[PDB]
Amino acid sequence: LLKEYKNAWDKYDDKQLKEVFALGDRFKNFISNCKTERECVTELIKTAEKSGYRNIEDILAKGETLKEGDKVYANNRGKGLIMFLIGKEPLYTGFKILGAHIDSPRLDLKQNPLYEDTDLAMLETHYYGGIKKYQWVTLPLAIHGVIVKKDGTIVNVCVGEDDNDPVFGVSDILVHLASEQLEKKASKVIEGEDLNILIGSIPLKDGEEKQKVKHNIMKILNEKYDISEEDFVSAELEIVPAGKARDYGFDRSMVMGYGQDDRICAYTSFEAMLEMKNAKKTCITILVDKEEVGSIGATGMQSKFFENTVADIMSDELKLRKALYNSEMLSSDVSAAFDPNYPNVMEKRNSAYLGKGIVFNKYTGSRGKSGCNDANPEYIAELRRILSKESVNWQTAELGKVDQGGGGTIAYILAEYGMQVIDCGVALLNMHAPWEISSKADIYETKNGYSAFLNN
Amino acid sequence: LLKEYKNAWDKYDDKQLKEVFALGDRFKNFISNCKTERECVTELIKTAEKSGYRNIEDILAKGETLKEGDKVYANNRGKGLIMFLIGKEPLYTGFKILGAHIDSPRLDLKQNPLYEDTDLAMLETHYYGGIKKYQWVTLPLAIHGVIVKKDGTIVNVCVGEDDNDPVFGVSDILVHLASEQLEKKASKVIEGEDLNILIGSIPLKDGEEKQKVKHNIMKILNEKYDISEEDFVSAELEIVPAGKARDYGFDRSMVMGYGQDDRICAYTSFEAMLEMKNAKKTCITILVDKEEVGSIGATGMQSKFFENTVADIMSDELKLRKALYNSEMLSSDVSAAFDPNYPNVMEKRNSAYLGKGIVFNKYTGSRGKSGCNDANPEYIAELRRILSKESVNWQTAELGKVDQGGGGTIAYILAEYGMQVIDCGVALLNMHAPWEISSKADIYETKNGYSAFLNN
Amino acid sequence: LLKEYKNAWDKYDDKQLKEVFALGDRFKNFISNCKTERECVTELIKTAEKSGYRNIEDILAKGETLKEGDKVYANNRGKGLIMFLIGKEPLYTGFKILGAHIDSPRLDLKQNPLYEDTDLAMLETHYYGGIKKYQWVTLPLAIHGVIVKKDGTIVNVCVGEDDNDPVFGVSDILVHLASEQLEKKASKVIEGEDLNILIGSIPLKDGEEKQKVKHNIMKILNEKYDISEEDFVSAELEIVPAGKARDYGFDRSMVMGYGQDDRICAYTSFEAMLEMKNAKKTCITILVDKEEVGSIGATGMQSKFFENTVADIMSDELKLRKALYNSEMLSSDVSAAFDPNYPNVMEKRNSAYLGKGIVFNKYTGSRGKSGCNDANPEYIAELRRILSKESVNWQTAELGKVDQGGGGTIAYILAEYGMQVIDCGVALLNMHAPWEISSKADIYETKNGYSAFLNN
Amino acid sequence: LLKEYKNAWDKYDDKQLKEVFALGDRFKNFISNCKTERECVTELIKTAEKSGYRNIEDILAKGETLKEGDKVYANNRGKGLIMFLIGKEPLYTGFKILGAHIDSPRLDLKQNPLYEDTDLAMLETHYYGGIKKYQWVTLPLAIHGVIVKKDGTIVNVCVGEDDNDPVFGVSDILVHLASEQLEKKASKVIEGEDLNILIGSIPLKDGEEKQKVKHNIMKILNEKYDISEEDFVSAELEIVPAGKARDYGFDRSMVMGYGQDDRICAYTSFEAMLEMKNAKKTCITILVDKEEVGSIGATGMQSKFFENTVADIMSDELKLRKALYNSEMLSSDVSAAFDPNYPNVMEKRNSAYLGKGIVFNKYTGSRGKSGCNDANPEYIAELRRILSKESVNWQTAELGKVDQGGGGTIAYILAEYGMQVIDCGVALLNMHAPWEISSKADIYETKNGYSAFLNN
Ligand SMILES: [Mn+2]
Ligand SMILES: [Mn+2]
Ligand SMILES: [Mn+2]
Ligand SMILES: [Mn+2]
Ligand SMILES: [Mn+2]
Ligand SMILES: [Mn+2]
Ligand SMILES: [Mn+2]
Ligand SMILES: [Mn+2]
Missing domain, CATH: 2.30.250.10 (Aminopeptidase i, Domain 2)
Structure with missing residues (x-):
């Protein structure tokens, strides 16, 4: 009758699940934010995805014959990156977008x-x-x-x-x-x-x-x-x-490192998008910067995405618009995890906790939800259903007790098209600090949450 | 040679005019903000306008044969609404837009x-x-x-x-x-x-x-x-x-109710637009939300209007642009009426008064007109001339003595196309309060002001 | 051996008890403070009690033959009301008084x-x-x-x-x-x-x-x-x-309305006194005003009661005094219920809670019980015993953690005769507010507490 | 319809009326508060009234045969004074009391x-x-x-x-x-x-x-x-x-002197009571002290009046009570006149003005009419009617804009019996100052107001 928020571990165990991430992501991620600390995530990431993808310059319509099962990427002056993955249905249908900023204070x-x-x-x-x-x-x-x-x-x-x-x-x-x-x-x-x-x-x-x-x-x-x-x-x-980022804690359950802020989501979103085969509806991954500074033009709120989904839709011309309007996005970014050292700053309930799965934020603004995207319930419900079938632990949070801190994610920037967006991400400890902390269980769960956004 | 602002009443009387609103709008409006207090204004309003209008799904080009005398509406995930009314001249000519937000604190x-x-x-x-x-x-x-x-x-x-x-x-x-x-x-x-x-x-x-x-x-x-x-x-x-909203005052001249903020304009703009027959130039009514929170994407600054005037222009393809650039809008929103309880907060002159007609705001910002749309005089003059022929009382106001309160209407959001916009609306008492007050005379006058924006 | 106050509900149920008040008092009371908001409680109440009572002008000694089973009322310039009910024993024995103020801020x-x-x-x-x-x-x-x-x-x-x-x-x-x-x-x-x-x-x-x-x-x-x-x-x-006052809460367990302050006690005390048949010792109900303003003369601390019990004792002349000295009163007035929104203002224990029965206040003053009536233990013990036999839930409270708020009930005003007084009443939420809240269970319990003060 | 008050003068003139006070009261009063500045008003006043009155010691029932047309006084240890005047009707009927304190800061x-x-x-x-x-x-x-x-x-x-x-x-x-x-x-x-x-x-x-x-x-x-x-x-x-007190102003319209505070009312009330012949209902004048200090016992809130109206009713024994309950009093005391030097301290309207007649105060307390007598409208209306027939200018006032100064007259002290009391008095300038100011016109008007309280 009443709702309870499960814990990530326990449920895991399986001897597999654990190994499948304890060393799983905590290795990939664990190493990503070590050999990449300055928006060159593009390079190291672009080097990966070598298992397909290209577009960039190789645009010949039939150069790769843009159709079923195709995968391409687009580099934005090295500061930004966007990946595609064509599916059965036509683009005009909609999209399955995953977004995240790769820059950090x-x-x-x-x-x-x-x-x-x-x-x-x-x-x-x-x-x-x-x-x-x-x-x-x-x-x-x-x-x-x-x-x-x-x-x-x-x-x-x-x-x-x-x-x-x-x-x-x-x-x-x-x-x-x-x-x-x-x-x-x-x-x-x-x-x-x-x-x-x-x-x-x-x-x-x-x-x-x-x-x-x-x-x-x-x-x-x-x-x-x-x-x-x-x-x-x-x-x-x-x-x-x-x-280098390190194992945090006597039980190696967390990870301490620089850049954790969203770069962790940018990664999970990556692997999820990367190992995503057999696509029903064309899905894409966006990775921009300048978010922590306001998300100004050139490489953040730019048209790099707009005038690209089109440059890609070309390979079936005219505006049509619907393409974007009928898409579903999961703009993710780290949230503040409840810190037992400073409790009076959060509402306890309605706050993300270290290890309770992926975080969902319906709204995230300031004085009265001011300036921020507000996810639609109908869309939220769907995500619920989905993250139930494929399992995956999730929790909903709010940034500090009402009139405390301010907020503003780049989620509304794309919703401007009419998409169904919602805020996701992992819960961190001491954000924007030279050394941030995260729960491997959450990292894992989050990825699965993303991947479980491939179908339906 | 010295302009003077006169009370809406007196001029009214006519025994008709009065009845035509004392119970006229104070009944329709008076009841609107009673059976609709949560942006479901869409529902109740969409149920009305049953006297035509549809579009939404019924798009067959000839399904309603988009041409002279046609009227259609577009629903934005239930949170927003926009109505059209085709006229003699072609869309490429321009438009006659009426805008207002339906959300409230x-x-x-x-x-x-x-x-x-x-x-x-x-x-x-x-x-x-x-x-x-x-x-x-x-x-x-x-x-x-x-x-x-x-x-x-x-x-x-x-x-x-x-x-x-x-x-x-x-x-x-x-x-x-x-x-x-x-x-x-x-x-x-x-x-x-x-x-x-x-x-x-x-x-x-x-x-x-x-x-x-x-x-x-x-x-x-x-x-x-x-x-x-x-x-x-x-x-x-x-x-x-x-x-339910109620009659305010011993002379039933005002109305006390929740949501009055712009929802009152959203209504008058509605009836005006609704009972508007024989259109020379295609005119449209917009009703969005999230204004009180910043007017962020999804259902406020979205493209729902942009990628819709087009989806509508389709029923005559390519951009052309001019369509919007040559339009005239009347983005309205309630203003602060002079309160005899706190006079030192306003400049007396250059302030809206309860009952002196519809309000006009050339500019409405903060420290030096910062962040806000500034209506062009040539356009203002025209509105003057118009609201003179069809009569209708109007008054110009400013929000508080210069460096007092802040401002910011969604008027500039559409002027971004090049339109001729200006701020309108009724004068309220104690805005954003659970119970707001308005002058029936003003409500009425305002509507006529809108309607008198159909042809000349 | 240890104590716990339990809750009013549960014990109720009975399918009867509930119905006997859920709609019982929440209807009578629920409607009383709707058709009576300005000390005209006198009128509406005087209209009731039509089932006997009169005195006022009809004083002929034998006009109603002042004796066993007689019931009369006395109006004080419409602002005050006092009801009597003669019993077997003689007045000289004592009285059973119920007091309450009908005025409100x-x-x-x-x-x-x-x-x-x-x-x-x-x-x-x-x-x-x-x-x-x-x-x-x-x-x-x-x-x-x-x-x-x-x-x-x-x-x-x-x-x-x-x-x-x-x-x-x-x-x-x-x-x-x-x-x-x-x-x-x-x-x-x-x-x-x-x-x-x-x-x-x-x-x-x-x-x-x-x-x-x-x-x-x-x-x-x-x-x-x-x-x-x-x-x-x-x-x-x-x-x-x-x-009109309304049902408060999803479970309709409380009542929200104006005047709740003591007017709720004044009512329960009324019904209790009204449906009180077969009296052993003559009992009387007092309802005055000006309490919230100091209880000054004319219609509060006046002699209206003094020079009336006598004018009534006449129908057996000379002072005697003892009449009042040997009486027992239950001067009731609402108390502050513990609000979960502002806990640090009360001592938790020794505080009235919504639904734990009728409230008892031994003392109620300011800096050190200053200026207030202090009930005698011997009398308190008796009330305990009584409210045990006829059951009825009761709880004892104190107004805020010691040196917090101030107090002063009209209880001492009558104790000046030597009576055995004590403070009673229901527990309210946000007192002296345009809209106060109360627990139906408490309303009910209180009444029974009063009625269970008819004998024993 | 609407209404105004206008200045006592003008109406006067008559060449008589003026002379009948310009030198009239401004001579009697004008000299009273000169040869009497320390509650010895009793002496000088008791010396006056030599035209009858005595009681004090001469109590023989027939010593003066207490009946129609009789007049007596009672001295309270020299600090207080009370005068009687028997009328046609019996005491049991009621009284016509005039009260005032003779002490001053x-x-x-x-x-x-x-x-x-x-x-x-x-x-x-x-x-x-x-x-x-x-x-x-x-x-x-x-x-x-x-x-x-x-x-x-x-x-x-x-x-x-x-x-x-x-x-x-x-x-x-x-x-x-x-x-x-x-x-x-x-x-x-x-x-x-x-x-x-x-x-x-x-x-x-x-x-x-x-x-x-x-x-x-x-x-x-x-x-x-x-x-x-x-x-x-x-x-x-x-x-x-x-x-000695002096003529204040170039037009000798006001009077400057010590003790003005109520001693002026105590005087007008005196002369009025003094030159009052042919009494229908027995009327009495009270003059106590200790008002400015709290009106404590001994010579203020004492029973000197209580156990005296009786000692007088004796010359027809037993309590009866009704005697006092059916009386009408006019407890007067000076009020604060609007000072053109400090306007922001008063509400302008609802404030007494120098020369607009006698002042009436329905209520006079502090934070919300706290602690003070509130005159009944039915009684007020009567006074209106009366002070209309015999003419006399009157004005209603309030002490300072709501939450400004505090108040508390000895009016409630006698209303405790059930009397119909109301606050009267003249309007002063700079109260409790070594030198107070008053309007001769008001002095005069006030007296007439009192005298016009003899019949009905
Ligand atoms: Mn971030
Ligand atoms: Mn961030
Ligand atoms: Mn607003
Ligand atoms: Mn608004
Ligand atoms: Mn109270
Ligand atoms: Mn109370
Ligand atoms: Mn004084
Ligand atoms: Mn005084």
Whole structure:
């Protein structure tokens, strides 16, 4: 009569189910957010899916004869990725979309980051995504991204990942003299001129020139690569915590790592979409960025998807529209899991819990559901039925007790067509933090939830 | 040479004019916002307009032979509605649009609303639309909305409307102990776990189980309908003040009721559009929701209109664009009427008054007209001329003395095409309150204003 | 050996007991506080009790031969009422009194309420009883009371009750501009010049005169009745929420309505006293007003009772005194029921709960039981024994955790004679609010508690 | 229809009416509160009424043959006074009472007032009545009251009234050094050890003894009278502003003087009662004190009236009660007149104005009419009719805009019997101030209002 929210484990066991993920996803995912921390998820992911897919340039209508069982991908200037999988029924029927953003909050060098203050030389930054809690100091950082020569040569940078690479970080006054630093926790650490990349070793051939420490590093930075102090202007700032994601907990039930935010959904959605064979209705996977920053144009709210489903529908011309209007999406993004350290911030009930399956959010806004997509019950009911047959544990959540925190997912952006969207995703611990936590059971369950969205 | 604004009454009289609305609209409208308080305005309204209109599914090109004198409607998943009326000239010429949102601020059950605290059992909620003034307590509430079974069965809920139905409400500490509740009127009543639906009557067959009061209600809720504690997940939360709208004032000149906000415009715009025969240029009426929450996608800023004027233009294919660019709209929404209780909040002049006709708002933003549509003078002048010939009283207003309150109508959303839009609507008293007030004279005048937007 | 208060229901059932009140009192009471909201309880109640009772003017000693089985009532200028019922034993023995106040907090027009500000015309008010929480705005109001012509003609006013009567109410700034209204919830809505009774409809024959809207309403108010702008001076201000009391809750276990405060006790005490046949010791029921305002003279702490028990003892002369000294009273008044929304305001234990029977309050004061009657244990024990034999559920309560709220019942006022008094009554939800809640089970139980005070 | 009040004058003129008061009451009253400033109003008043009246000790039943046309007075330990006037009908019928307090706020010496600090010698005080605004400094003071020798000899003190008597007063720091005295106007002048009665003139025969200045004054105080430093213990402290009341204004339309508070009503009520011949129903005038301090026992809420109407009814024994219950009273006391210097403190309408006749107050309490008598409309209407026939201008007022100031008249104290009471009185300017202002027209009108309360 009354409803109870099952737990993911127990039900699992099976000796199979467990193994099928304990090491299953916690290996694939567990490693994904280690060798990919800067929206280059595209590369590593595009390398995968080598088991078919192409489109991109190979558009000859019959180059791959766009029809039943075909699979293609489209790259958006390397920052975004969208995958297709044609099915029996015609596109005009509808679609089965899975969406997720691959970007994540982080720090990143300014246009002229290199400067030298008091001997040592720092590197200007400018946080992105709203890490708000600037407790990004002390812990070890690594540099990623890319630099573009004036001639157009793209050089890849990745320092601090290998156990032999040096590391970087932001300093913070010692407690002994941090007395004056007490006003408002809200922010007493917020500048954008932090992070020193080199001490002494001053300088290059010791040929004078005030900024010796700086001069030296530029030269060191010149030997590797082939940049100049300029070039940074046309570079790609990327500071992220160093270290591979790890097993979290004495029972290895969780995973601690950077980027967990949605990148975990972007992954499960990937595998689900990847190992999806025999399609009844053409389904597609979208992976964009700029979500954490507002989802502005170019590579987020862009038409890259719009003017692509069409460029794909071409391989059966004119608008028709219905194509998108009759689709069903599952725009997923991580949610806040109930933390036993700060309970008064959530409503207990109506809150996602670590390990109770995949999360569903009918609405997610601010002062009165303001600015956000509101899933239709009829559609929700369907998902219920579906996630019942193929099983899979699911739970519904809300972000904090009513008037607490704010929300806004990219779910409404596509619903603008008339689709049936709803918010999904895994429950995380300490979001937007350099190290996030997740439940392997949830990761697993979520994937199955996605995969169980192939049929009907 | 010096314009002066005159009371709608007096001019009326005629013994006819009065009767033609005193009981005229105050009956139709007066009853509309009584039997429709939860965006089901679509249903009751779609039932009306039975005098023609259809489209929806009956699309055969010649199924109704889309041409002169034809009238059709389009339903948007029940949450939205748009009506057409073909005229002599071709669509490519332009359109005569009337828009309004049918949604209104209210409370509405969470995903897992049923819970039991200290004997009695409450129902979690989460206000929508920004009622900000949570003085939604003490007074009697009714439940509306719909619940969807896992199988897809749609059950309709409407408790608290009939004089024999029980009622509901939110409690508030008695003044005797409300002493500690003094800090910031801004909010000392704001939770989302209010509203008890049942006391004692504990429980069902008294078969133990801690949450007895709860268990009992779920069972009671099970006999009627056929839901379980779940299902709420795929339900449609809807708490609204109970009671029919009434005649307000010793002279029955005003109307007190819930939903007045724009639903009053949505109505006058309806009748105007409905009793509109012999069309020169094809005109259409739009009624969407989610306005009070931001007008997000799916059922507000969606393409439902875009990809529909076309699906309709089909019954003469290719974009052409001009169709929309050459249209004229009258996006209406209620405005704040000058309240003699709080005068210092408005500029006196440049403020709408109760009974001085239909209201016009050239602009309506915040700090410096920020974020809002600004009507063109050339278009305004035209409306003037028109609302002069067919008579009709009109007045121009501004929302509060400059840097007071904020604004933002869905007028700019359609002007994005290049249309000639302007803000209209009736003047209300205490907006977004469980009980709003309006002037019958204004209601009437407004309608005539709309209707007088048919030809000249 | 240990105690637990149990619940009223369960014990009931019997299929009879339930029916004997579910519809039993919830019908009588349920309707009482609907057709009587302004201390006219006297009238409707005096009309009842037609099954005997009279006294008033018919005092002839043998006019009704004051002796065994006689029943009479005494009206106090219509504002108060007291009923008697002679028993076997002589008055000199003692009495069995039941007391309660019939007045309740509300708004009410000043001496010169009618005025016109900015077109429309309002009506000055001045709350009574201490509604403190001026959240009496937005919701619909009705006018009651009486107006007295200079000649002495009493005209009755009752507008807003019938489904066809117009309504009234107090306005409040829309949230859009309510920003400046944030300081102290304690009071940012408190004036006494609120409530508009008429808009436009300006004016009467349009014969000029600045205050047209006003002039018109006075004329309208003149056609009905026959008053002038004066007369209000000798009128009886009475603004109360409109609408009949209703069934509260999905299980119709409670009742929501205005006046619940003590008027509920005044009723149960009535029926109990009414259907009380075969009296051993003469018992009497008192119903006064002005309690919510201090219980001042004229119709509260007056001698109306004193110089009446005597005027009645006459039908055996001289003081004797003992008559009152040897009586037992049950001065009842509603208490605050534990609200699951605001728990920290009460001590949990030692607090009345919705449905645990009739409430008993040994003491009820402020800073240290200050200013209030303290019931004697010997008397309390007796009541226990009694309410055990005839059964009836009872619970003891305290108003808020010690130093929280203040108290003061009219119980000590009669104990001044030496009587054995104690505080009784039903437990309510949100007291002094336009809409109060009560448990039918408690209503019932309370009555039985009273009736079970006829003998033993 | 509508209505206005207009200024008592104009209507007057008559050349008679004016003279009949311009010099009429402004002479009698004008002089009363000059030769009587300390509840010795009794003496001067008792000396008047020499035209009959006595009772007091002369109680012989036939000593004056208590019957038609008889007039007697009763003295209450000199602090209170009550006058009777038998009429045709029997006492059992009812009474026509006029009440008023004769006491007024003022300062008054402690039990041990005489002390010497730094040369000069002061006199301890302790304000009475709540002058709250301690702006009782700088201006000239006079001493009244009485001192009682141990033997019982009553000595009368009255210093500072004759143009040749010395004066007294309270000092206050010069503005030059009053800088530190800025915190809270609420009170930065509040001690009770102010008022110096003698400088230098140190001392008596210069026979040493530290407190010389003191010693000297005691001696000086000894020559006159015959007191010692003790005796003050059994003395009657009385400090009041010195000077006769005067004509206020260029048109001599008002009167400025001390004691105006109710003492003005106590006077008009006196003359009215005094020149009242041919009585239909026995009418009586009451004049008590302690009102400004709470109206406590002994000489205010005492039984002096109760056990007196009886001691008088004796000259027809047993309680009967009805005697008082069927009476009509006019408990009067000054009200606050609208001051053009501080308008925002009153509601404009519903406020008494200087010169618009006698004032009527249906209610006068605090937070919601709390603690105060509420006059019945039926009674009010009657007064209207009456004050219409005999003419007389009247106006209704309220003390400050709702939740402003507090109130509490001794009107409810007698209504406790069941009488028909209502608040009357003249409108004053700056109440409880050392110098109050009143309108001669109002004074006059009020008296006529009282007198016009003789028949029916
Ligand atoms: Mn995210
Ligand atoms: Mn995020
Ligand atoms: Mn709005
Ligand atoms: Mn609106
Ligand atoms: Mn009360
Ligand atoms: Mn009460
Ligand atoms: Mn006073
Ligand atoms: Mn006074």
